[PDB]
Amino acid sequence: PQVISATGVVKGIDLESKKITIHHDPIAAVNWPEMTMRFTITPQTKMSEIKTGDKVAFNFVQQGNLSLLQDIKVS
């Protein structure tokens, strides 16, 4: 779209199911308060090495009921 930047903390990562759970700060761009959400990852998501408990900066777009990561790095 409509790429949306957020920050948060990694709560869980699963490269098998292709999900990363992030506790993120509010996102006024889409009227989300503080929440823990599953973000979808693809072979195309630009990744740095991130671990559970890491503080992260990330970009994502929305399409379907999926929130799809375009990249993610450690903050």
Q: Which residues bind Ag ion (CB under 5 A)?
A: 32, 35, 37
Based on CB atoms, which residue is closest to Ag ion, 4 or 37?
Answer: 37
* Sign, Cα dihedral of 2, 7, 40, 18: positive
- Closest approach of Cβ 74 to Ag ion, in Å? 20
DSSP 7: E
C-beta of 43: minimal distance to Ag ion in Å?
23
> Of 13 and 32, which CB lies nearer to Ag ion in the complex structure?
32
Tokens 């408990």 found at: 53
Comparing CB distances to Ag ion, the nearer of 28 and 49 is 28
Count CB atoms within 10 A of the CB of residue 54: 18
